[PDB]
Amino acid sequence: GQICDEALQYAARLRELEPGWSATPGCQLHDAEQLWLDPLRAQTDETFLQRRLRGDWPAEVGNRFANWLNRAVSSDSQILGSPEAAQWSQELSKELTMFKEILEDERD
């Protein structure tokens, strides 16, 4: 819970004092996976700018949170012999789903 809260606090502190978020040299992956730490609306936005300028969901965020939870704890092929590891895995899945539901409303 402290790791998830620290991640949420870092994500809130990153996209508050950095208004630069648009097309630029070296900003390709900062539009799809950067749906969390994404800037405001641009100056030359198009009509359907809800997908190419700011998608209305953390689309790449959930897989990244799942991969971070898988890399932060080295789960093995015998990590569910009792409910101790499986309970932490269920808690990690529930925390990832809660963070996804929270980040989905970020673009609105």
Partner: protein, 305 residues
């Protein structure tokens, strides 16, 4: 102690040259008694004309920079002072050490009175937000907004009016603008059970306080114990050590209409938990309740979990 009808959110509030020390044993964030007294003074200024009440606060601390320095390879800190004017001669005689701090706090106030009953919703928030900008919240001035991206978002959020899913959506919408902060809540029950845990030798509360907030390193007969949270010692109200007096009795009182007492601080426990990790925001309001029979004058937060 009454649950409020509305949570009037005071926005990002830069306050400069605050009181850092705030207690004889702490030096960090200012006392929450300053916040409850600030809300009571704001009530005495605006709420009598607005026909409302104001009780609680949400202390979130978006940023905090102290006026300290770490002097030349030491593990401690010292305080930055301010040069005072001279005496009748050029002595620079007395230098009393008090700290300062700049903090960006944002409070949320519990309203009780006729908020929506006889008054509008945005106008009361506009009036209280332009009223709280001409006073001081902890011992230092409340800096106004002169920078860019003009917010003025005094969200006068209603709580008891609406369906339950709309109410939870309102709570998670108000928590969106508490984004980098950290709410401070008392944990008196935690200090009590942590006192009962180490009562094997001598169950002093001032020893359970002074051996919990630290990092107690203890090896294997090679680690530090697991940090349960962001535990801080805070002043949790006063405690009298002299009986009550009459208004004009005690020499040099602040005013000769209210009685005087000689009191002494009480040190409670507190936590800086993220605003996402609370069910409702009205769970984390600081009220000050007093028991004038004995000497306890305690501010705390009920329903803190």
């Amino acid at each position: 102690v009454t649950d409020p009808e509305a949570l009037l959110l005071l926005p990002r509030l830069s306050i400069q040259n605050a009181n850092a020390i705030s207690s004889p044993l702490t030096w960090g964030f200012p006392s929450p008694g300053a916040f409850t007294g600030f809300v009571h003074a704001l009530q005495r200024r605006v709420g009598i004309s607005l026909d409302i009440e104001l009780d609680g606060v949400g202390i979130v601390c978006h940023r905090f920079e102290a006026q300290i320095s770490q002097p030349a390879g030491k593990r401690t800190k010292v305080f930055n002072l301010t040069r005072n004017p001279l005496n009748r001669d050029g002595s620079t005689a007395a230098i009393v050490e008090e700290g300062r701090a700049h903090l960006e706090v944002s409070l949320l106030l519990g309203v009780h009175g006729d908020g929506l009953d006889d008054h509008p919703a945005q106008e009361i928030a506009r009036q209280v937000q332009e009223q709280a900008g001409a006073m001081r919240l902890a011992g230092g001035s409340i800096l106004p907004w002169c920078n860019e991206r003009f917010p003025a978002p005094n969200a006068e959020l209603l709580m008891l009016g609406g369906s339950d899913e709309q109410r939870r959506k309102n709570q998670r919408r108000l928590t969106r603008r508490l984004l980098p902060g950290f709410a401070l809540v008392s944990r008196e029950a935690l200090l009590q059970q942590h006192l009962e845990t180490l009562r094997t030798t001598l169950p002093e509360a001032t020893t359970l306080d002074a051996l919990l907030d630290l990092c107690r390193i203890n090896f294997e007969p090679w680690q530090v114990r697991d940090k349960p949270g962001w535990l801080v010692p805070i002043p949790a109200g006063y405690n009298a050590l002299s009986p009550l007096y009459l208004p004009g009795e005690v020499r040099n009182a602040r005013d000769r209409e209210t009685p005087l007492r000689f009191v002494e601080n009480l040190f409670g426990l507190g936590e800086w938990l993220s605003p996402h990790r609370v069910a409702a925001l009205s769970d984390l309001l600081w009220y000050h309740h007093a028991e004038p029979d004995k000497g306890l004058y305690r501010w705390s937060t009920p329903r803190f979990v």
